[PDB]
């Protein structure tokens, strides 16, 4: 997954 946040 790419993720959902900018950091962490």
């Amino acid at each position: 997954a790419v993720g959902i946040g900018a950091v962490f």
Partner: antibody, heavy 118, light 113 residues
């Protein structure tokens, strides 16, 4: 010893509101986001949404926006998912999983079976 | 959202033989600059899913080299040569670029013996 310990299986009345917990241990909590999956024997696996705890920033599948509410306790290294009005379609096994940016679901929780029944 | 299509949804294979699972994404799942975040997981009855592949062709740490992921554009394939009883379960493919993330219907690997 990365560990995601989920709460125990439940029976909840239709229209009730239940709270599942996922306690992380063995790594630095605020470095990862917690994503939540739903598994049913007919549908299969579904992504519900995610929370980045260090910040508290959530994002939800439109199927589950409104019903599932993700929060995060940074002290106890815990992530909560709330179901606000349970339906017969909410009976499932719910999973938490950790993720860092551009990563993958490497560590999974043990799953919380929710049965909605009268 | 993007629909992931696994085929077959149940796959019988003789012991020691080869097996291939086809997973097709309805849209492109290439991330703006880096590869499509196409991951393969395996689940056994009564266990959490386990990660095998990420970034279509990267084996995860500890996974036997008998598992190989491939594909481009929207066409993806998992290949298990020399299948052992330890490889039983439901294999799910999964996209992790476009929200909401989605899984395929799963594919049940079953031994002939």
């Amino acid at each position: 010893q990365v560990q995601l310990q989920q709460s125990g299986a439940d029976l909840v009345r239709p229209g009730a509101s239940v709270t599942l917990s996922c306690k992380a241990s063995g790594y630095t909590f605020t470095d990862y986001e917690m994503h939540w999956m739903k598994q049913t024997p007919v549908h299969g696996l579904e992504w519900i949404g995610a929370i980045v705890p260090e910040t508290g920033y959530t994002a939800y599948n439109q199927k589950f926006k409104g019903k599932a509410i993700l929060t995060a306790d940074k002290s106890s290294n815990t992530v909560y998912m709330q179901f606000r009005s349970l339906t017969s379609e909410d009976s499932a096994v719910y999973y938490c999983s950790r993720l860092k940016l551009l990563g993958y679901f490497d560590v999974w929780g043990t799953g919380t079976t929710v049965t909605v029944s009268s | 959202d993007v629909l992931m299509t696994q085929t077959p949804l149940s796959l019988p294979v003789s012991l020691g033989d080869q097996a291939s699972i086809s997973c097709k994404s309805s849209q492109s799942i290439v991330y703006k600059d880096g590869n499509s975040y196409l991951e393969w997981y395996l689940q056994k009855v009564g266990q959490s899913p386990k990660l095998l592949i990420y970034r279509v062709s990267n084996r995860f740490s500890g996974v036997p080299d008998r598992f190989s992921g491939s594909g481009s554009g929207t066409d993806f394939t998992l290949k298990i040569s020399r299948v052992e009883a330890e490889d039983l379960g439901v294999y799910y493919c999964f996209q992790g670029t476009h929200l909401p993330y989605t899984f395929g219907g799963g594919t049940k690997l079953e031994m002939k013996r």
